[PDB]
């Protein structure tokens, strides 16, 4: 392991919403594949369905298009039309509270699922353990 084991409560069961801290924005996967945020909630891209794969470790697929999210191997984001190594994520409690995703394929360079303060994916190597960008907190659909 390169990461700690502290995992946060709640389940699978339902999809939920993914919301950025930073710049108060939902994660969203596009119909092209693009994946950014958005503060529209009744956008219909922001809808992800989560999954264990492993104890810790998601997949974080889009309801509407059934897209995975993956990060590549230059730290972008992108949806997945079929799920593969990209697409899994150690899923984590951050700061007692919110929920961090780091890729798995990617783990040990700390690069992390996140959101500028407008919107905009960050590349992997710009995230980093400490930074707002990376706290999301799923919210029910």
């Known amino acids: 392991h390169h990461h700690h084991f502290n995992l946060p409560p709640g389940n699978y ?11 108060g924005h939902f994660l969203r996967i596009l119909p092209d594949g693009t994946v950014d945020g ?7 891209h922001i809808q992800l369905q989560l999954s264990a794969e492993s104890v810790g470790e998601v997949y974080i697929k889009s309801t509407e298009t059934g897209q995975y999210l993956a990060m590549d191997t230059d730290g972008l984001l992108y ?4 799920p593969n190594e990209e697409c899994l994520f150690l899923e984590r409690l951050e700061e007692n509270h919110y929920n961090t995703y780091i890729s798995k394929k990617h783990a040990e360079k700390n690069w992390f699922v996140g959101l500028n303060k407008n ?6 190597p710009r995230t980093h ?7 999301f907190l799923p919210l029910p659909v």
Not at 119 to 124: A, E, L, P, Y
């Open 119 to 124: 919107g905009s994916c960050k590349r992997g």
């Open 129 to 135: 353990y400490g930074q707002k960008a990376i706290l």
């Open 79 to 82: 949806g997945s039309q079929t």
């Open 38 to 44: 958005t503060r529209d909630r009744s956008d219909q």
């Open 13 to 23: 069961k339902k999809p939920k919403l993914l919301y950025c801290s930073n710049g």
